[PDB]
Amino acid sequence: EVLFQGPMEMILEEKDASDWIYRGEGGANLVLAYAGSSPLFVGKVIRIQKARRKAIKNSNGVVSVLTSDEQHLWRENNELISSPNKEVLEQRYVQNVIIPLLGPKHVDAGVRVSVSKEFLECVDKKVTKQRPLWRVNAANVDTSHDSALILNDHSLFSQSGGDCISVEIKPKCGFLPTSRFIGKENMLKTSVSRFKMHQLLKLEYIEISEESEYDPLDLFSGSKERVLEAIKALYSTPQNNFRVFLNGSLILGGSGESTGRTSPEIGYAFEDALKGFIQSEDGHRTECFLQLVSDAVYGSGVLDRLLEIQKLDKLDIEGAIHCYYDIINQPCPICKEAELSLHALPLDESLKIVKEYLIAATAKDCSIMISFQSRDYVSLKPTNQTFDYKVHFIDLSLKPLKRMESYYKLDKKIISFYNRKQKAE
Numbered sequence: 248e249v250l251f252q253g254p255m256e257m258i259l260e261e262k263d264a265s266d267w268i269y270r271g272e273g274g275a276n277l278v279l280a281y282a283g284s285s286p287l288f289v290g291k292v293i294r295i296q297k298a299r300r301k302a303i304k305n306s307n308g309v310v311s312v313l314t315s316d317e318q319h320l321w322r323e324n325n326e327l328i329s330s331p332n333k334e335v336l337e338q339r340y341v342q343n344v345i346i347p348l349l350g351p352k353h354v355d356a357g358v359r360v361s362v363s364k365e366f367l368e369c370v371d372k373k374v375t376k377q378r379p380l381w382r383v384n385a386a387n388v389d390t391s392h393d394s395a396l397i398l399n400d401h402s403l404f405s406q407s408g409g410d411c412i413s414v415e416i417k418p419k420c421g422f423l424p425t426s427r428f429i430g431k432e433n434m435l436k437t438s439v440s441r442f443k444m445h446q447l448l449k450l451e452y453i454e455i456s457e458e459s460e461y462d463p464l465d466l467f468s469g470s471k472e473r474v475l476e477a478i479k480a481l482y483s484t485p486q487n488n489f490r491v492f493l494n495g496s497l498i499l500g501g502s503g504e505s506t507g508r509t510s511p512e513i514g515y516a517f518e519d520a521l522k523g524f525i526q527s528e529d530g531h532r533t534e535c536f537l538q539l540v541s542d543a544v545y546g547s548g549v550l551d552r553l554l555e556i557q558k559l560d561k562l563d564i565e566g567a568i569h570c571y572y573d574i575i576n577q578p579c580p581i582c583k584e585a586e587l588s589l590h591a592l593p594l595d596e597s598l599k600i601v602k603e604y605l606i607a608a609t610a611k612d613c614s615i616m617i618s619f620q621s622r623d624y625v626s627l628k629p630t631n632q633t634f635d636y637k638v639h640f641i642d643l644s645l646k647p648l649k650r651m652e653s654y655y656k657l658d659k660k661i662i663s664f665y666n667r668k669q670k671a672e
């Protein structure tokens with residue numbers, strides 16, 4: 248019998264920085280994979296929030312997690328609107344808003360760990376050279392936070408077997424709006440997907456090398472032909488929607504950003520990297536892997552549950568924005584003759600519309616990670632091997648209420664540019 252220390256919350260300090268290595272990042276978070284051997288952390292990633300190089304302050308000048316409007320918008324959950332920091336808040340947003348709608352089979356609020364400012368600084372220093380320049384220009388780790396999130400590394404299975412092939416799909420929005428509030432001049436928004444139209448604008452700003460062949464309407468069609476077609480397009484033009492890891496190591500896609508089209512060189516390189524994982528011929532392992540990914544995604548039904556959250560955007564930003572201006576008690580700058588009748592709604596109805604809009608916005612920007620190891624399972628019809636797979640949602644971030652205004656401007660920019668390109672053509 249031996250005396251053990253009492254329970255104490257874990258704190259990653261400056262020393263521990265050498266144990267984490269760059270895995271990736273999106274617009275809001277940096278993700279590091281644990282390299283050490285502590286059981287606490289093997290098979291985990293650490294997700295560290297970035298700061299855009301304007302704080303939120305309460306009426307006392309104190310720095311705050313939610314504005315008054317946000318704390319009212321999300322008031323239905325007491326713990327949520329009481330969160331002392333952005334890691335708590337995101338953790339409770341997932342547990343108490345997303346998990347009820349999505350279910351917990353493929354969703355994990357994660358676990359908080361304490362971090363010292365020096366840990367955050369050394370981490371930021373350590374990885375800078377592996378981040379994309381433009382990501383570095385836009386944001387670094389927010390060293391003023393005292394927590395981070397520990398998640399499972401969906402790029403491994405470990406707890407058996409050997410090689411693990413994992414895939415990330417960022418599916419974006421898989422339906423077309425039908426709102427009464429889309430004017431006639433914008434009606435192409437009802438026949439052409441936001442993702443398609445945004446492609447054109449992305450090209451104008453040199454944010455992508457080429458238009459994607461991917462169509463979310465195929466991926467969310469519930470038709471296995473279209474799902475596979477979508478997987479094939481994602482393979483051809485990954486951009487920032489498709490990644491593939493071998494034992495946690497990028498073998499297709501971009502590191503923290505979009506990548507350009509798959510060239511025969513990049514395809515040959517990939518075809519080889521599947522050697523031994525996909526028992527198959529020589530120029531055929533890719534064809535089988537794409538089939539594997541299509542069958543796993545389709546068989547899991549995760550896309551259908553996700554699509555129903557994305558459809559909580561019932562009125563489109565062009566209707567939702569009017570409820571926003573009522574929510575924040577500002578005269579509506581959109582109305583200048585308009586369907587307006589939104590503005591006659593009771594407060595709680597305007598609140599529910601915007602709240603549901605932001606939840607939908609979470610569902611439009613989340614990712615899906617599918618993990619594979621040779622033998623839930625999928626069996627290939629040609630090769631006849633069985634593969635174990637797990638599916639996991641990542642990146643269910645709560646969206647800031649003030650971004651409604653940014654949502655509406657971007658939408659205005661997108662349909663307006665897309666209309667012009669239809670005209671001049």
Ligand SMILES: O=P(O)(O)O[C@@H]1[C@@H](OP(=O)(O)O)[C@H](OP(=O)(O)O)[C@H](O)[C@H](OP(=O)(O)O)[C@H]1OP(=O)(O)O
Nearest residue numbers: 273274275276419445487504608611612646650657
């Ligand atoms: O607005 P969208 O649809 O372009 O989505 C943004 C994403 O662009 P995408 O079109 O997927 O390349 C954008 O993706 P990248 O930064 O380009 O990877 C971000 O996810 C952004 O969210 P945040 O800045 O992390 O809060 C996303 O912003 P939200 O709309 O999710 O706030």
Ligand SMILES: Nc1ncnc2c1ncn2[C@@H]1O[C@H](COP(=O)(O)OP(=O)(O)O)[C@@H](O)[C@H]1O
Nearest residue numbers: 271272273274275276278398399400401641642
């Ligand atoms: N739990 C995880 N397991 C494995 N990889 C992950 C995990 N979470 C994130 N990643 C990788 O890190 C990237 C950034 O994570 P994400 O939460 O999407 O950041 P952001 O919110 O900034 O977009 C992801 O696109 C994914 O490739």
Ligand SMILES: [Mg+2]
Nearest residue numbers: 273612614642
């Ligand atoms: Mg992301």
Ligand SMILES: [Mg+2]
Nearest residue numbers: 273275642644
């Ligand atoms: Mg995000």
Ligand SMILES: [Zn+2]
Nearest residue numbers: 569579581582
């Ligand atoms: Zn209005």
